[PDB]
Amino acid sequence: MKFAVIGNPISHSLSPLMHHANFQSLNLENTYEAINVPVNQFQDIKKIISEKSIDGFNVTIPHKERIIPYLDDINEQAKSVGAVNTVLVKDGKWIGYNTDGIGYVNGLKQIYEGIEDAYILILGAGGASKGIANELYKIVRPTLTVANRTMSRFNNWSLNINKINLSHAESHLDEFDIIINTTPDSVISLNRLASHTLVSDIVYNPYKTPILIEAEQRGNPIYNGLDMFVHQGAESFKIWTNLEPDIKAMKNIVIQKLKGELLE
């Protein structure tokens, strides 16, 4: 089978390396290639992919929205956030998925015990926040809390959650078991942060953002966006292939790369 990641630029994507470690562990004779697609060529995307007999592809910057008009259908997770990160080519029809939110949550489930009973705060009200809230809503009992500096950007949220501002988040911070930052200086004061709270950021470059550094200094466990990147790709793989990805091999190769412990 033939897979790809499309984006512009594309050469920094760690997707081809990660996906290749999964192919190796599972003895699959597949390709996964970085495909450079300038915006000025993007109207020809169907020809660009079809010509290479690609069975499925990930979508990164700047095409997660741009891709949508070119799809034959699109799932609810993807319509909900207004972005596609995963395309399935099935009998030449293009079907859109979004594995970012579910990838985050699937990672978080394996390091946090008892997520069903967690009180969860999410910082930021954008697409990445909405995708994660979408998946958490399905499995978390205590109602979700989302904090943004402006309350207006919750205007397109259908989801029924607690909407708070940042200073309220800061003063009630000890009420939360998990804090999930999705905002691009620690974004919130951590002066009222309880000792047990998992502090998390969807970013893994840098490997610790300022929120994660300040939290870890107070002794809190911290959790960056590395698991989210592996699980999002693993989920795309499950859509494309119906096989079970090797999470450990996929994570371990990205760690090796970031450590500069791979040779070329």
CSV table of C-alpha atoms in Angstrom, one decimal:
chain,number,residue,atom,x,y,z
A,1,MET,CA,0.0,0.0,0.0
A,2,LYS,CA,1.0,3.7,-0.6
A,3,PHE,CA,0.7,6.4,2.0
A,4,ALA,CA,1.7,10.0,2.3
A,5,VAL,CA,1.6,13.3,4.2
A,6,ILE,CA,0.8,16.4,2.2
A,7,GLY,CA,1.8,19.9,3.4
A,8,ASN,CA,3.8,23.0,2.4
A,9,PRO,CA,6.5,22.9,3.6
A,10,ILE,CA,6.8,19.2,4.4
A,11,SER,CA,10.4,18.1,5.0
A,12,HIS,CA,10.2,18.6,8.8
A,13,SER,CA,7.3,16.1,9.2
A,14,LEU,CA,8.3,13.2,11.4
A,15,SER,CA,5.3,11.2,10.0
A,16,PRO,CA,7.3,9.3,7.4
A,17,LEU,CA,9.9,8.2,9.9
A,18,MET,CA,7.3,7.2,12.5
A,19,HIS,CA,5.1,5.3,10.1
A,20,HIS,CA,8.1,3.5,8.7
A,21,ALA,CA,9.0,2.2,12.2
A,22,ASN,CA,5.4,0.9,12.4
A,23,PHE,CA,5.7,-0.8,9.0
A,24,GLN,CA,9.0,-2.5,10.1
A,25,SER,CA,7.6,-3.8,13.4
A,26,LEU,CA,4.6,-5.3,11.6
A,27,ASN,CA,6.5,-6.5,8.4
A,28,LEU,CA,4.4,-4.5,6.1
A,29,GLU,CA,5.9,-3.6,2.7
A,30,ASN,CA,4.3,-0.2,2.4
A,31,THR,CA,5.4,3.4,1.5
A,32,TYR,CA,4.8,6.5,3.5
A,33,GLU,CA,6.2,9.6,1.8
A,34,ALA,CA,6.4,13.3,2.4
A,35,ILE,CA,4.6,15.0,-0.6
A,36,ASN,CA,5.4,18.7,-1.1
A,37,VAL,CA,2.2,20.5,-2.3
A,38,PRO,CA,2.4,24.3,-2.8
A,39,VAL,CA,-0.9,26.2,-2.4
A,40,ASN,CA,-0.5,27.2,-6.1
A,41,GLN,CA,-0.7,23.5,-7.1
A,42,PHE,CA,-3.4,22.6,-4.6
A,43,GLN,CA,-6.3,22.9,-7.2
A,44,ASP,CA,-4.6,19.8,-8.8
A,45,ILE,CA,-4.5,17.7,-5.6
A,46,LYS,CA,-6.6,14.9,-7.0
A,47,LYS,CA,-4.3,14.3,-9.9
A,48,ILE,CA,-1.2,14.7,-7.7
A,49,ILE,CA,-2.4,11.9,-5.3
A,50,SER,CA,-4.2,9.6,-7.9
A,51,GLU,CA,-1.2,9.5,-10.2
A,52,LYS,CA,0.9,8.0,-7.5
A,53,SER,CA,-1.7,5.4,-6.5
A,54,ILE,CA,-1.9,6.6,-2.9
A,55,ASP,CA,-4.3,4.7,-0.7
A,56,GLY,CA,-4.4,7.2,2.2
A,57,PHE,CA,-2.7,10.3,3.4
A,58,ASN,CA,-2.2,12.6,6.4
A,59,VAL,CA,-2.7,16.4,5.9
A,60,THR,CA,-0.7,19.1,7.7
A,61,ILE,CA,-0.1,22.8,7.3
A,62,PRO,CA,-1.5,24.7,5.4
A,63,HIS,CA,-4.1,22.3,4.0
A,64,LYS,CA,-6.3,21.0,6.9
A,65,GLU,CA,-9.1,23.2,5.9
A,66,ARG,CA,-8.2,23.6,2.2
A,67,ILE,CA,-8.6,19.8,1.7
A,68,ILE,CA,-12.3,19.7,2.5
A,69,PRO,CA,-14.0,20.9,-0.8
A,70,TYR,CA,-12.1,18.1,-2.5
A,71,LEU,CA,-13.6,15.3,-0.4
A,72,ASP,CA,-16.5,13.0,-1.4
A,73,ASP,CA,-17.5,12.7,2.2
A,74,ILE,CA,-16.3,13.6,5.6
A,75,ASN,CA,-16.9,12.3,9.2
A,76,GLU,CA,-18.5,14.0,12.1
A,77,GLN,CA,-15.3,14.5,14.2
A,78,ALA,CA,-13.8,16.3,11.2
A,79,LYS,CA,-16.9,18.4,10.4
A,80,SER,CA,-17.2,19.3,14.1
A,81,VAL,CA,-13.7,21.1,14.2
A,82,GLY,CA,-13.7,22.2,10.5
A,83,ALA,CA,-10.4,20.5,9.7
A,84,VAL,CA,-9.3,17.1,8.1
A,85,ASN,CA,-6.0,15.5,9.1
A,86,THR,CA,-6.6,12.0,7.5
A,87,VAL,CA,-7.9,11.1,3.9
A,88,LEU,CA,-8.9,7.5,2.9
A,89,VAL,CA,-8.9,6.7,-0.8
A,90,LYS,CA,-11.4,3.9,-1.2
A,91,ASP,CA,-12.3,2.9,-4.8
A,92,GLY,CA,-11.1,6.4,-5.8
A,93,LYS,CA,-13.5,8.2,-3.5
A,94,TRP,CA,-11.8,10.5,-0.9
A,95,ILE,CA,-13.2,10.2,2.6
A,96,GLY,CA,-12.1,12.6,5.3
A,97,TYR,CA,-11.4,11.9,9.0
A,98,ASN,CA,-9.7,13.8,11.9
A,99,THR,CA,-7.6,11.8,14.3
A,100,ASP,CA,-6.0,14.7,16.4
A,101,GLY,CA,-8.6,14.9,19.2
A,102,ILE,CA,-9.0,11.1,19.6
A,103,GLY,CA,-5.2,10.7,19.4
A,104,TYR,CA,-4.7,13.1,22.3
A,105,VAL,CA,-7.4,11.4,24.5
A,106,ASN,CA,-6.2,7.9,23.6
A,107,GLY,CA,-2.7,8.9,24.9
A,108,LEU,CA,-4.1,10.5,28.0
A,109,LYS,CA,-6.2,7.4,28.9
A,110,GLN,CA,-3.1,5.2,29.2
A,111,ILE,CA,-1.1,7.5,31.6
A,112,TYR,CA,-4.0,8.9,33.7
A,113,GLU,CA,-5.8,6.5,36.0
A,114,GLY,CA,-9.6,6.9,36.3
A,115,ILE,CA,-10.2,9.6,33.6
A,116,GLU,CA,-14.0,8.8,34.0
A,117,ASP,CA,-13.9,10.7,37.4
A,118,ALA,CA,-11.4,13.5,36.4
A,119,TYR,CA,-12.3,17.2,36.8
A,120,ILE,CA,-10.8,18.5,33.5
A,121,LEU,CA,-9.9,22.1,32.6
A,122,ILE,CA,-9.0,22.9,28.9
A,123,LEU,CA,-7.3,26.2,28.1
A,124,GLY,CA,-8.3,27.7,24.7
A,125,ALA,CA,-11.5,27.6,22.7
A,126,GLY,CA,-10.2,26.8,19.2
A,127,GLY,CA,-10.3,23.7,16.9
A,128,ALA,CA,-7.7,21.7,18.9
A,129,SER,CA,-9.6,22.4,22.1
A,130,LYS,CA,-13.0,21.5,20.5
A,131,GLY,CA,-11.5,18.2,19.1
A,132,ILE,CA,-10.2,17.1,22.4
A,133,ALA,CA,-13.4,18.2,24.3
A,134,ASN,CA,-15.4,16.3,21.7
A,135,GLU,CA,-13.7,13.0,22.6
A,136,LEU,CA,-13.5,13.6,26.4
A,137,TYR,CA,-17.3,14.4,26.6
A,138,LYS,CA,-17.9,10.8,25.5
A,139,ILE,CA,-16.0,9.2,28.5
A,140,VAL,CA,-15.7,11.8,31.3
A,141,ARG,CA,-18.5,12.0,33.9
A,142,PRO,CA,-17.7,15.4,35.6
A,143,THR,CA,-18.8,18.1,33.2
A,144,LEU,CA,-15.9,19.7,31.3
A,145,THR,CA,-14.5,23.1,31.9
A,146,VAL,CA,-13.0,25.3,29.1
A,147,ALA,CA,-11.3,28.7,29.8
A,148,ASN,CA,-10.6,31.4,27.3
A,149,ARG,CA,-9.7,35.0,27.7
A,150,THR,CA,-12.7,36.0,25.4
A,151,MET,CA,-16.0,34.3,26.0
A,152,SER,CA,-17.2,35.1,22.5
A,153,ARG,CA,-15.2,32.4,20.9
A,154,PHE,CA,-17.4,29.8,22.6
A,155,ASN,CA,-20.2,31.2,20.2
A,156,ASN,CA,-19.7,28.2,17.8
A,157,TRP,CA,-19.5,25.6,20.5
A,158,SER,CA,-22.6,23.3,20.6
A,159,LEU,CA,-21.1,21.2,23.4
A,160,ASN,CA,-22.6,21.9,26.8
A,161,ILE,CA,-19.6,22.5,29.1
A,162,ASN,CA,-18.6,25.1,31.7
A,163,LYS,CA,-17.3,28.2,30.0
A,164,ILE,CA,-15.0,30.3,32.2
A,165,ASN,CA,-12.4,33.1,31.8
A,166,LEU,CA,-8.8,32.8,32.7
A,167,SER,CA,-8.7,34.6,36.0
A,168,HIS,CA,-11.6,32.4,37.2
A,169,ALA,CA,-9.6,29.4,36.1
A,170,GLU,CA,-6.6,30.7,38.1
A,171,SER,CA,-8.6,31.3,41.3
A,172,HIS,CA,-10.4,27.9,41.1
A,173,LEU,CA,-7.4,25.9,39.8
A,174,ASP,CA,-7.2,23.5,42.7
A,175,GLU,CA,-10.6,22.1,41.7
A,176,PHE,CA,-9.0,20.5,38.6
A,177,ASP,CA,-7.3,17.0,38.3
A,178,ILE,CA,-6.1,17.6,34.6
A,179,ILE,CA,-5.3,20.9,32.9
A,180,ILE,CA,-5.0,20.7,29.1
A,181,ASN,CA,-3.3,23.7,27.4
A,182,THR,CA,-4.2,24.2,23.7
A,183,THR,CA,-3.1,27.9,23.5
A,184,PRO,CA,0.0,28.8,21.4
A,185,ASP,CA,5.1,33.1,30.0
A,186,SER,CA,2.9,30.4,31.5
A,187,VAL,CA,-0.6,31.2,30.0
A,188,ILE,CA,-2.2,31.0,33.5
A,189,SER,CA,-0.8,31.6,36.9
A,190,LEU,CA,0.0,28.3,38.7
A,191,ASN,CA,0.0,29.8,42.2
A,192,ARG,CA,-3.1,28.0,43.2
A,193,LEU,CA,-2.2,24.7,41.5
A,194,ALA,CA,-2.9,21.5,43.6
A,195,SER,CA,0.0,19.1,44.0
A,196,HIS,CA,-1.7,16.0,42.3
A,197,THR,CA,-2.9,17.8,39.1
A,198,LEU,CA,-1.7,16.6,35.7
A,199,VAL,CA,-0.5,19.5,33.6
A,200,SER,CA,-0.5,18.9,29.9
A,201,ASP,CA,0.2,20.8,26.6
A,202,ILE,CA,-0.6,19.6,23.0
A,203,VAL,CA,2.9,20.9,22.0
A,204,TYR,CA,6.1,18.8,22.1
A,205,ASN,CA,8.3,21.4,20.4
A,206,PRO,CA,9.6,22.7,22.7
A,207,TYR,CA,9.7,19.5,24.7
A,208,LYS,CA,8.4,21.5,27.7
A,209,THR,CA,6.5,24.8,27.3
A,210,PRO,CA,6.6,27.5,30.0
A,211,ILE,CA,3.3,26.1,31.7
A,212,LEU,CA,4.9,22.6,31.9
A,213,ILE,CA,8.2,24.0,33.3
A,214,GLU,CA,6.5,26.0,36.0
A,215,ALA,CA,4.2,23.1,36.9
A,216,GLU,CA,7.1,20.5,37.2
A,217,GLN,CA,9.0,23.0,39.4
A,218,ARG,CA,6.0,22.8,41.9
A,219,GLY,CA,6.3,19.0,41.7
A,220,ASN,CA,3.4,18.3,39.4
A,221,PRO,CA,3.4,15.6,36.8
A,222,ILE,CA,3.6,17.0,33.3
A,223,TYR,CA,2.6,15.6,29.9
A,224,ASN,CA,3.5,17.0,26.5
A,225,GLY,CA,2.0,16.5,23.0
A,226,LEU,CA,4.2,13.6,21.9
A,227,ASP,CA,1.7,10.9,22.7
A,228,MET,CA,-0.8,12.9,20.7
A,229,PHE,CA,1.3,12.9,17.6
A,230,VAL,CA,1.9,9.1,17.7
A,231,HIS,CA,-1.7,8.2,18.5
A,232,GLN,CA,-3.1,10.5,15.8
A,233,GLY,CA,-0.9,8.7,13.2
A,234,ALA,CA,-1.7,5.3,14.7
A,235,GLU,CA,-5.4,6.1,14.4
A,236,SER,CA,-5.0,7.1,10.7
A,237,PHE,CA,-3.3,3.7,10.2
A,238,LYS,CA,-6.2,1.9,11.8
A,239,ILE,CA,-8.6,3.6,9.4
A,240,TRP,CA,-6.5,2.8,6.4
A,241,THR,CA,-5.4,-0.8,7.1
A,242,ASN,CA,-7.6,-2.4,9.8
A,243,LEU,CA,-4.4,-3.5,11.6
A,244,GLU,CA,-3.1,-2.8,15.0
A,245,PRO,CA,-0.2,-0.2,15.1
A,246,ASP,CA,3.0,-0.6,17.2
A,247,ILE,CA,2.7,2.5,19.5
A,248,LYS,CA,6.0,1.8,21.2
A,249,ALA,CA,8.0,1.5,18.1
A,250,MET,CA,6.4,4.6,16.7
A,251,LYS,CA,7.0,6.7,19.9
A,252,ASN,CA,10.6,5.3,20.3
A,253,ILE,CA,11.7,6.4,16.8
A,254,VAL,CA,10.4,9.9,17.3
A,255,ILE,CA,12.3,10.1,20.7
A,256,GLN,CA,15.5,8.9,18.9
A,257,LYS,CA,15.1,11.6,16.3
A,258,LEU,CA,14.4,14.5,18.7
A,259,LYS,CA,17.4,13.3,20.8
A,260,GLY,CA,19.5,13.6,17.6
A,261,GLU,CA,20.5,9.9,18.2
A,262,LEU,CA,19.7,8.9,14.6
A,263,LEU,CA,22.5,9.1,12.0
A,264,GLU,CA,22.6,11.0,8.7
